[PDB]
Design a protein around this ligand. Sequence first.
Ligand code: SUE
Ligand code: ZN
Length: 190
Amino acid sequence: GSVVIVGRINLSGDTAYAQQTRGEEGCQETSQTGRDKNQVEGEVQIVSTATQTFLATSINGVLWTVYHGAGTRTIASPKGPVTQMYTNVDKDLVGWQAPQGSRSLTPCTCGSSDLYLVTRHADVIPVRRRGDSRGSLLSPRPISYLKGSSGGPLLCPAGHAVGIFRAAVCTRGVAKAVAFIPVESLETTM
Ligand SMILES: C=C[C@@H]1C[C@]1(NC(=O)[C@@H]1C[C@@H]2CN1C(=O)[C@H](C(C)(C)C)NC(=O)O[C@@H]1C[C@H]1CCCCCc1nc3ccc(OC)cc3nc1O2)C(=O)NS(=O)(=O)C1CC1
Ligand SMILES: [Zn+2]
């Protein structure tokens, strides 16, 4: 079945917080039809498949996420299933067209190396950029704390997107760094 939107990570007002906008029973049904009537808002969504929950990010008219979450699934829209606009397995990438209601982020051009990852829990965790696809956390966390966050953006200190969270670098079960698909790598895909 189709990937379904089931909430959003908000940074609209002042505070960073999750907003579940759908329940579970009524997930495994919209995922049958792919007709999502529910109101969608803003940049960072929570989407789910039957088995998994993870994030997805809109940057200039494309809702991006990870292929390792979404597989080759359509997404649910008010008009039916919306086919993937972009599907790179190697990168771990999947793009659809930005769903209706949404906002979209602006792609980062300031080349700052201070960044901010956004987990499914509404935590905006500091990350110092460390080259190409990678960043180091200022305060390491256990892996489990970040599972379900793939698809969320890394932001720069002015609101723009630098990439999309892909994987976490762990030893001992502890994450001191992460792997993301940089924005330069997205428009290359387009
Ligand atoms: C903090 C959680 C973290 C963000 C999450 N990502 C992962 O867990 C990924 C998925 C998988 C293993 N991942 C990892 O993070 C591992 C892990 C040991 C688990 C820390 N880390 C790791 O390999 O480190 C190595 C240095 C990097 C080398 C690069 C790794 C390659 C990345 C990757 N690519 C592809 C492309 C296609 C695939 O086809 C199906 C599959 C893939 N799988 C991949 O990695 C997540 O939250 N997921 S999620 O939301 O819970 C789930 C619902 C969706
Ligand atoms: Zn920037």
